[PDB]
Scaffold this active site. Sequence first.
Site, PDB file in Angstrom:
ATOM      1  N   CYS A 184      93.649  -3.349 -29.344  1.00  0.00           N
ATOM      2  CA  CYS A 184      93.867  -2.679 -28.066  1.00  0.00           C
ATOM      3  C   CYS A 184      93.380  -1.194 -28.023  1.00  0.00           C
ATOM      4  CB  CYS A 184      95.303  -2.942 -27.614  1.00  0.00           C
ATOM      5  SG  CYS A 184      95.508  -4.715 -27.270  1.00  0.00           S
TER       6      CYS A 184
ATOM      7  N   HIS B  12      99.442   5.076 -24.031  1.00  0.00           N
ATOM      8  CA  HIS B  12      99.165   3.666 -24.270  1.00  0.00           C
ATOM      9  C   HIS B  12     100.188   2.761 -23.603  1.00  0.00           C
ATOM     10  CE1 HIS B  12      97.202   0.255 -25.904  1.00  0.00           C
ATOM     11  NE2 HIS B  12      98.235  -0.090 -26.654  1.00  0.00           N
TER      12      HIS B  12
ATOM     13  N   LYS C 255      99.464   1.095 -17.049  1.00  0.00           N
ATOM     14  CA  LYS C 255      99.602  -0.350 -17.337  1.00  0.00           C
ATOM     15  C   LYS C 255     100.697  -1.010 -16.502  1.00  0.00           C
ATOM     16  CE  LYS C 255      97.713  -0.711 -22.115  1.00  0.00           C
ATOM     17  NZ  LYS C 255      97.407   0.716 -22.351  1.00  0.00           N
TER      18      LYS C 255
ATOM     19  N   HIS D  53      97.620  -5.161 -19.167  1.00  0.00           N
ATOM     20  CA  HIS D  53      97.063  -4.742 -20.437  1.00  0.00           C
ATOM     21  C   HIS D  53      95.794  -5.548 -20.701  1.00  0.00           C
ATOM     22  CE1 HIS D  53      96.458  -3.403 -24.317  1.00  0.00           C
ATOM     23  NE2 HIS D  53      97.645  -3.579 -24.860  1.00  0.00           N
TER      24      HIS D  53
ATOM     25  N   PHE E 299      96.400   2.386 -28.654  1.00  0.00           N
ATOM     26  CA  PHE E 299      96.689   1.911 -29.976  1.00  0.00           C
ATOM     27  C   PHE E 299      96.482   0.404 -30.080  1.00  0.00           C
ATOM     28  CE2 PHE E 299     100.157   5.017 -28.894  1.00  0.00           C
ATOM     29  CZ  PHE E 299      99.503   6.133 -29.347  1.00  0.00           C
TER      30      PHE E 299
ATOM     31  N   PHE F 229      97.122  -3.337 -32.726  1.00  0.00           N
ATOM     32  CA  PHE F 229      97.649  -4.001 -33.892  1.00  0.00           C
ATOM     33  C   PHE F 229      96.842  -3.583 -35.102  1.00  0.00           C
ATOM     34  CE2 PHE F 229      99.469  -8.102 -31.763  1.00  0.00           C
ATOM     35  CZ  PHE F 229     100.498  -7.370 -31.202  1.00  0.00           C
TER      36      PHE F 229
HETATM   37  C1  LIG Z   1     107.491  -7.877 -35.253  1.00  0.00           C
HETATM   38  C2  LIG Z   1     107.613  -7.858 -33.934  1.00  0.00           C
HETATM   39  C3  LIG Z   1     108.777  -7.179 -33.268  1.00  0.00           C
HETATM   40  C4  LIG Z   1     108.518  -7.279 -31.767  1.00  0.00           C
HETATM   41  C5  LIG Z   1     109.659  -6.558 -31.075  1.00  0.00           C
HETATM   42  C6  LIG Z   1     109.464  -5.749 -30.031  1.00  0.00           C
HETATM   43  C7  LIG Z   1     108.107  -5.466 -29.507  1.00  0.00           C
HETATM   44  O1  LIG Z   1     107.985  -4.593 -28.667  1.00  0.00           O
HETATM   45  C8  LIG Z   1     106.912  -6.245 -30.015  1.00  0.00           C
HETATM   46  C9  LIG Z   1     106.780  -7.484 -29.108  1.00  0.00           C
HETATM   47  C10 LIG Z   1     105.625  -5.416 -29.852  1.00  0.00           C
HETATM   48  C11 LIG Z   1     105.591  -4.097 -30.638  1.00  0.00           C
HETATM   49  C12 LIG Z   1     104.353  -3.356 -30.178  1.00  0.00           C
HETATM   50  O2  LIG Z   1     104.410  -2.646 -29.188  1.00  0.00           O
HETATM   51  N1  LIG Z   1     103.228  -3.548 -30.882  1.00  0.00           N
HETATM   52  C13 LIG Z   1     101.990  -2.978 -30.498  1.00  0.00           C
HETATM   53  C14 LIG Z   1     101.286  -2.094 -31.318  1.00  0.00           C
HETATM   54  O3  LIG Z   1     101.773  -1.723 -32.523  1.00  0.00           O
HETATM   55  C15 LIG Z   1     100.063  -1.582 -30.915  1.00  0.00           C
HETATM   56  C16 LIG Z   1      99.515  -1.953 -29.694  1.00  0.00           C
HETATM   57  C17 LIG Z   1     100.198  -2.834 -28.876  1.00  0.00           C
HETATM   58  C18 LIG Z   1      99.621  -3.247 -27.559  1.00  0.00           C
HETATM   59  O4  LIG Z   1     100.257  -4.087 -26.862  1.00  0.00           O
HETATM   60  O5  LIG Z   1      98.525  -2.771 -27.186  1.00  0.00           O
HETATM   61  C19 LIG Z   1     101.429  -3.352 -29.274  1.00  0.00           C
HETATM   62  O6  LIG Z   1     102.081  -4.237 -28.449  1.00  0.00           O
HETATM   63  C20 LIG Z   1     107.154  -6.600 -31.502  1.00  0.00           C
HETATM   64  C21 LIG Z   1     106.020  -7.451 -32.105  1.00  0.00           C
HETATM   65  C22 LIG Z   1     106.621  -8.517 -33.017  1.00  0.00           C
HETATM   66  C23 LIG Z   1     107.388  -9.500 -32.137  1.00  0.00           C
HETATM   67  C24 LIG Z   1     108.520  -8.772 -31.399  1.00  0.00           C
END
Ligand SMILES: C=C1C[C@@]23C=CC(=O)[C@@](C)(CCC(=O)Nc4c(O)ccc(C(=O)O)c4O)[C@@H]2C[C@@H]1CC3
Lengths: 407, 407
Positions: free
Chosen positions: A161, A296, A328, A333, A391, A393
Amino acid sequence: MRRVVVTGMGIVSSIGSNTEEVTASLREAKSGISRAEEYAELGFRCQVHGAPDIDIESLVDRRAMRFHGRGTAWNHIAMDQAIADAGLTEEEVSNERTGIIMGSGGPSTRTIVDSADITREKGPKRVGPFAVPKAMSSTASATLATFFKIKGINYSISSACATSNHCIGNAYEMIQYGKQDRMFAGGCEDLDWTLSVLFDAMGAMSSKYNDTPSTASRAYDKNRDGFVIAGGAGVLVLEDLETALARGAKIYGEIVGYGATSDGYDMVAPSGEGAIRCMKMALSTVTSKIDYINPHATSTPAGDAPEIEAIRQIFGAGDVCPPIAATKSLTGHSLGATGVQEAIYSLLMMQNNFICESAHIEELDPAFADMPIVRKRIDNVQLNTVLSNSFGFGGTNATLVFQRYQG
Amino acid sequence: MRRVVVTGMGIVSSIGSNTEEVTASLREAKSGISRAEEYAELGFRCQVHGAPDIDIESLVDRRAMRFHGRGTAWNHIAMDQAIADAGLTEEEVSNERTGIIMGSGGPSTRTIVDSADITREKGPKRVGPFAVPKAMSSTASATLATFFKIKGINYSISSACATSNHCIGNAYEMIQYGKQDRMFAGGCEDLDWTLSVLFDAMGAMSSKYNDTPSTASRAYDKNRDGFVIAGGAGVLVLEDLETALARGAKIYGEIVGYGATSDGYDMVAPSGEGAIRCMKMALSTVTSKIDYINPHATSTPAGDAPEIEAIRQIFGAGDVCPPIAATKSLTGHSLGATGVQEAIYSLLMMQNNFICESAHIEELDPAFADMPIVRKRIDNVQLNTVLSNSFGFGGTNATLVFQRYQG
Ligand SMILES: C=C1C[C@@]23C=CC(=O)[C@@](C)(CCC(=O)Nc4c(O)ccc(C(=O)O)c4O)[C@@H]2C[C@@H]1CC3
Ligand SMILES: C=C1C[C@@]23C=CC(=O)[C@@](C)(CCC(=O)Nc4c(O)ccc(C(=O)O)c4O)[C@@H]2C[C@@H]1CC3
């Protein structure tokens, strides 16, 4: 190092098919989010998306389309817009001093899946001969470099992203360091169940608002519950300052900082400290205050807060902090496309003297009550310097800062 | 601009699972190509491939593997090797001055297809929660940056079959320009029918030699009939010269030139003139003669010749031209991984004072009879400067030049 300016923009977005439509959506906080019935049919939890509404076949001819996925076709459109906006001649597009850094979060996942399906149903030959340039990770640069006869730099940056923020930053560096005088930079993403399901399976996308799709994306709201996925594209034309001045270019803004860092922490969640270092690096070369932050902020429960904390550490809280508005919430997104689209939203807000509402905040998360998150559009504001984060993953961070050119 | 040196290497290849095995294969012209029975089962024309033989589960633990595709797992192995080779401490791997530019031609196409299949057979939840980092184009950088706790630059370049050459070149630039002091650079590719079929459908891969698989890849042979696909990975550790000297690094070579250009011509065939400009750009900063050329040469009918013509235009013909030996005749074509693997082959040949045979030439194409294509291994040769090309679909070109460090 040379100065670098933005001289043209193009965009295909959930909130408009050109910069005029996009500006109107930002000004009026018109959501681009709708119900995705296909996702309901397939049994997804999340049943919302941010879909472009644009007639590809009317804007890109059949022979160009031979090698395009939908994402790169949207990118082609945005490229055409940016070239027109910049007023470039054919010679200015196609020359050894002019390159392209154009990326996507993924390739055409639909091409990959359709090809695997038809291989098994009807045989390998029935995949057809045109699938590789759609399926490869460089699809956005490969297609556009070939069709627009680009002769200089030609590759894609991929950083999930953050993709199109890095694409812009690296293009910026190429011009700063004298290797190229003009660059097309940005990126794209298809919108397709074969990609979206990968995020639904991880529970990353909004599902509590399926009955009110337009408000599902709601960065900073107490009850946010995931991002809303989108497709589209964006392109900036970048030029060294002397090249731009000499041809009487429109200057939308000057790129004045770029940061790129790595968290080295968690695959799918941000550390926060990486973002701090990224913003500091972008700001290290900036000599005016920031007037607007395009975060972001994706509307995930665990994502929005560490970024706000990083902003707090750099900027402070309350009135001393720059206004923050999460676009967003309106756009969803668009993954690979989001960095460049957010640069364009920010540059259009600068042009039009307003900061959009940070939409769909029905109840502010109290953890953010100390921060100047924009709750109502701010008019008649002189934006001179704006900052945008993206940002991804894998702990990947990119920040850009743009400034109104005043000499 | 600072000088930049290679201080460690790692590799997973069809011709060996470390640099020792690879060196032995190059020296003895041991082909890495075998029959791909799965491709015959699926009805491909091409039924040959270059498959690594390495036990992933013994070298990467289950928790790391959570987010790895096979390609990035091979990349992880190569990274471990390169870090060991370089003798880096944990502190030297994980710091703000040390980054990673690591790419692949595509993501894990197998993850994409399996996810689509299981969505339709058993439901979206059964995709599981770990698919995104495998399916995204940044998978090679995302995974390794997170697991090795990289804090500096973190992204992927994607440029189809030029990918890992551009990754090395851009890492080189980052160090030259003072932004980073150490970089891990390279790339990878899975080997999987879901990618390979896209090339079979276009008729790009060898099929006339299915009954003699070991000799199917045969750059410059009159009867070549397509490339032979392969998987694997490679990593270089790059450092600014003072950083390397100060810690008593092994120096495998110095990066002394890098070119990157664009054909702006055809999606899936090279123009030739782009390659000329690319090699000239890489050579523009080189002050010794080239002693060996590692070509892109993939064994396609239409690919090998325009590169030879470009070489003719720069270097001339016969004895005045540097020796040319196409390592893909032994290794096949690992797509994203091929640039870095060819850099490693070239640096190992430099280290070991030999130039490998350009293998499987049973009848030289007469169009190349004037060129010094190596027909038998050359021993006891002092290689001081070596050049390696990689090109990709979408008209993308990258060239690197490495030099023996002598002060
Ligand atoms: C291990 C976990 C814990 C969990 C709990 C709450 C959350 O908010 C999410 C869903 C996403 C975290 C995040 O914002 N990552 C994250 C990131 O680092 C960088 C970019 C983005 C993006 O969307 O552009 C992003 O999304 C995470 C991911 C996964 C499942 C649930
Ligand atoms: C339109 C055509 C004509 C056709 C005829 C003869 C050929 O040799 C191939 C198969 C491949 C050309 C080529 O080397 N591309 C080509 C290229 O530009 C850059 C890189 C590579 C690579 O393998 O890394 C490559 O392969 C082309 C491709 C497609 C079908 C048959």
